[PDB]
Design a protein around this ligand. Structure first.
Ligand SMILES: NC(=O)c1ccc[n+]([C@@H]2O[C@H](COP(=O)([O-])OP(=O)(O)OC[C@H]3O[C@@H](n4cnc5c(N)ncnc54)[C@H](O)[C@@H]3O)[C@@H](O)[C@H]2O)c1
Ligand SMILES: NC(=O)c1ccc[n+]([C@@H]2O[C@H](COP(=O)([O-])OP(=O)(O)OC[C@H]3O[C@@H](n4cnc5c(N)ncnc54)[C@H](O)[C@@H]3O)[C@@H](O)[C@H]2O)c1
Ligand SMILES: NC(=O)c1ccc[n+]([C@@H]2O[C@H](COP(=O)([O-])OP(=O)(O)OC[C@H]3O[C@@H](n4cnc5c(N)ncnc54)[C@H](O)[C@@H]3O)[C@@H](O)[C@H]2O)c1
Ligand SMILES: NC(=O)c1ccc[n+]([C@@H]2O[C@H](COP(=O)([O-])OP(=O)(O)OC[C@H]3O[C@@H](n4cnc5c(N)ncnc54)[C@H](O)[C@@H]3O)[C@@H](O)[C@H]2O)c1
Ligand code: NA
Ligand code: NA
Ligand code: NA
Ligand code: NA
Ligand code: NA
Ligand code: NA
Ligand code: NA
Ligand code: NA
Ligand code: NA
Ligand code: NA
Ligand code: NA
Ligand code: NA
Ligand code: NA
Ligand code: NA
Ligand code: NA
Ligand code: NA
Lengths: 268, 268, 268, 268
């Protein structure tokens, strides 16, 4: 019946009802998965948001920069899903770069402390979460992280693009470790999605020049994509994550699946 | 229930019960698809082989070098599935290179007539089949072709690797045309599979040097793959094709999905 | 003194004074190389054109589809440069695709006979020329071919882009063969250059839609290139070919050097 | 005469007479460049080492993690080369990862503080140096950094490979900034070179497993490279850096030139 029937899956990264991870969680539940959610900092808000998912799911606190949160995560997950049960899936949908590393602020003016925080949250934490959770993952399991194609430089996204380049490299090493558990590790490289932060940026939150550049980027994406690209609809991305969480891509690991309308395959 | 329930899917490329397309067809039927099969030249043999699939499927003759076969294909498919019905999926699992273009024969000694025949069958025909079948494909449909990663030169596969480089390029253009129909086009890049031809080559059919090189290639593949690689098991490849035929990769087109154990993501 | 002082270098592909190979030949002579030229079909025209190069150079006929021309080429070169002398460099600057394979004519409507001729001239002939000339190349020599980045599909260039994908694959195999002679093989992927044919296409020779698409492609190239791109100036491309012909890239082979203003490294 | 005659070029990264930057500096001086050198921490040692270069060159202290060193660098360079003179070239040959991020120590056990230091020195500092030096670079200038192909995960190099993935991304953004000055930015991806640190690692300094894996990596490199690979000879790498510092790759930026014997173009 459901693509993910019986699977136990941890989903990080919900902060609003427009988070990509909110849609990942909704579709996974539609497909029969039993979820455990993790949230950062504003847990009352996240609980109120995820009350709207089609099924109940326990919410655990996880700041990926907090060593104590990471050290206790597996035991808290096991308590939530029951002793003797393990996870079949993990979704990393976590990203952050201080404002100095994006938008109008010149690329050269981002101090390393800011870049380092952004790489910690956006790239290193993919390894951190796999380290914490692989000991409680079943063979045949799947770890999926969210990516944005960084193979070519862009306007505005600056150091966040560098962080995604690092994340793609981290994923290839996580795949080596995860394989020892019979677990796959892959990224979904999505086209642009109008999350609250992205809408705020297009609205000029990081400077008019950066907002204009990002609006132009979105327009070219739908133009290039042979099947089009709808930045207001995260469901195609959520479905692709669920495909990697399923048993139907069993020989793919260390890899990147592009849920971008095909835009990255076309020049114009 | 089934991943492909209700979908009508054409599968080319069955010649033995170890053909990758035989396993594609079996898994697709297991997942509820209604198939139409195409075969080249030895139709009594192919019918006897496909009698072992879990469900009946009409068999149509298709030599992709035959313009008349291509011009009549859509009408013959429609007759097989019924007027007013269209295809949801197409599988291209067709490849050939004359012996002069592979194995012990020096790369420089393949005459162009032989290379051209191999590129016709292995690359151009992906465009030929899409041209013939897109007019009878439903929106939301999917065209999938079989690939072998040609981004780096290898021993022995010589001009067939060139043909796959061409195929990957053709796929990106087919995606442009298919998008106008609401149809996706993608390739699955598989690791090595012990088909009858591959077993015969490892056995020395194309020279001892080529057999030795191919055996070494297979060994390195399983070694590199973080989840391993079983050349005797086509099912992981067949499942990946079915994933692309399903509705669960709806924003991927013009693209390549690697069903190779992750080997291409690792150096050693 | 000269970058190429004392080197003997064969340059194919001159047909007008705006051919990329005309500028390759001029710069190579400026840098002290002694050239042998090859031309296709219109030899009186090519001789009149190359009379304007800074130094004399013998002109040999070479139709790369003519097996007899290829079989006699080495002996004719040796006669031109003197017994006991060998070539240090070879430049392949040859490309062709029938009109049916480019521009307004739909991608699906190019007959295979036309595509096959274009792949013969544009891709297979890189292997043909290396086969003919490696027996008369010195260790430390260099073979260079002209490329146009085909990693993503474009409007209009259709089957010529497929042919470049094939050429890049051929180059990686030629490098394997050339290495046995101590010879390197590489491609230069150039940005768009306003040759006579390209000007004619922008002028609508292959349909208004194709001319418009190509003009848009040129505009985006200069916009993306961090150092800009001047389609009216082939000299930066010619210099890059000369760099690969020199001794200053001695550990690069099977590879692609991008002389494109950096455009392919940037999204926008 | 000399490839770099009259050019003023800053070279970082000398620590021993087997440093890649020592050979870069030697070849650049052989080709007529006037150098300024930067060294980290052990300046008496570095001065004694660089006394063996064919020409005198002033040595400036530069710890790329020291904001004060970076803020004063341009003024100290100008003092060394004379008011009214600017640099034509910059060589970044700087890399470091704490031991916890390489070798026998499990990938997951590297603490982020260590990874962050390694990314600071190995990747961010490429942007730091360009920021400091672009204001005193001439149009037509060239910035070159040293890379090791990180597109596929490897044994042992672990987080240093992640750092190179980040560096490649940084280079594409530096190219955008440098283009405004008429300056190119590129990396040379070298094959393995037996520096003192690399010899020490093969000797087991980071665990026997890591030493064995690295020795196997070197062996496969020479085997794959169509022209071979000599890990005891940095001169082919130094020459390639000088090519990018010259005027002979004037349309290449944001890019990576592979000085690796062609190994990355071949599977086996
Ligand atoms: N929106 C897009 O266009 C787009 C495109 C491609 C990929 N992505 C990626 O998708 C992922 C989800 O981002 P989103 O667009 O849904 O935005 P979002 O703001 O909805 O989600 C980002 C999440 O990161 C979490 N986070 C930040 N710091 C954290 C910490 N220290 N510990 C734990 N969690 C932390 C936030 O709480 C938030 O839940 C990110 O990796 C993002 O880069 C986004
Ligand atoms: N076996 C492997 O290791 C491997 C790995 C990756 C990709 N592939 C690819 O998978 C596809 C299927 O090959 P296979 O390994 O299953 O071998 P196979 O021999 O079982 O199938 C090849 C098919 O091509 C068909 N064919 C040949 N000429 C034809 C023509 N003129 N018209 C129509 N059909 C024609 C043959 O009849 C045969 O059915 C090919 O594209 C192949 O390159 C194979
Ligand atoms: N102009 C561009 O924008 C551009 C960009 C990147 C790469 N290129 C490539 O550069 C190379 C040179 O093309 P060009 O732009 O200078 O155009 P051109 O028309 O000046 O040169 C093409 C050459 O191919 C030769 N040729 C055609 N058929 C032949 C045959 N059968 N035998 C021998 N030679 C034959 C022609 O005689 C001509 O000399 C081609 O490979 C082309 O694809 C061109
Ligand atoms: N040896 C190889 O196999 C190889 C292969 C490809 C690329 N590389 C790269 O070449 C570059 C040079 O490395 P190498 O192999 O010549 O080793 P090396 O040890 O000789 O040089 C590394 C340099 O980095 C400098 N450095 C470290 N911390 C610094 C700081 N805080 N500030 C300024 N400088 C600092 C060191 O002083 C040293 O001079 C590195 O980027 C390295 O990753 C090396
Ligand atoms: Na959304
Ligand atoms: Na649930
Ligand atoms: Na941690
Ligand atoms: Na579109
Ligand atoms: Na099989
Ligand atoms: Na059926
Ligand atoms: Na046809
Ligand atoms: Na393995
Ligand atoms: Na010109
Ligand atoms: Na000459
Ligand atoms: Na020939
Ligand atoms: Na520009
Ligand atoms: Na050395
Ligand atoms: Na000097
Ligand atoms: Na700094
Ligand atoms: Na070799």
């Amino acid at each position: 019946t459901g693509l993910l029937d019986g699977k136990r899956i941890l989903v990080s990264g919900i902060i609003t009802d427009s988070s990509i991870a909110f849609h990942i969680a909704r579709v996974a539940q539609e497909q029969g998965a039993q979820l455990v959610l993790t949230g950062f900092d504003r847990l009352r808000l996240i609980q109120r948001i995820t009350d709207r998912l089609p099924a109940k799911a326990p919410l655990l606190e996880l700041d990926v920069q907090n060593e104590e949160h990471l050290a206790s995560l597996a035991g808290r997950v096991t308590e939530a899903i029951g002793a003797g049960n393990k996870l079949d899936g993990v979704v990393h949908s976590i990203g952050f770069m201080p404002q100095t590393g994006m938008g109008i602020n010149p690329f050269f003016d981002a101090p390393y402390a800011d870049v380092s925080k952004g790489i910690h949250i956006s790239a290193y934490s993919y390894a951190s979460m796999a380290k914490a959770l692989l000991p409680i993952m079943n063979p045949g399991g799947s770890i999926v992280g969210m990516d944005f194609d960084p193979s070519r430089a862009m306007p505005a996204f600056n150091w966040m693009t560098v962080a995604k380049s690092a994340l793609e490299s981290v994923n290839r090493f996580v795949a080596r470790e995860a394989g020892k558990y019979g677990v796959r590790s892959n990224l979904v490289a999505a086209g642009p999605i109008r999350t609250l932060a992205m809408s705020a940026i297009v609205g000029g939150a990081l400077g008019e020049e950066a907002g204009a550049q990002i609006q132009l980027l979105e327009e070219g994406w739908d133009q290039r994509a042979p099947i089009g690209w709808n930045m207001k609809d995260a469901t195609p991305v959520a479905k692709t994550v669920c495909a990697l969480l399923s048993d139907w891509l069993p020989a793919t690991t260390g890899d990147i699946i592009y849920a971008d309308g095909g835009a990255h395959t076309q020049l114009l």
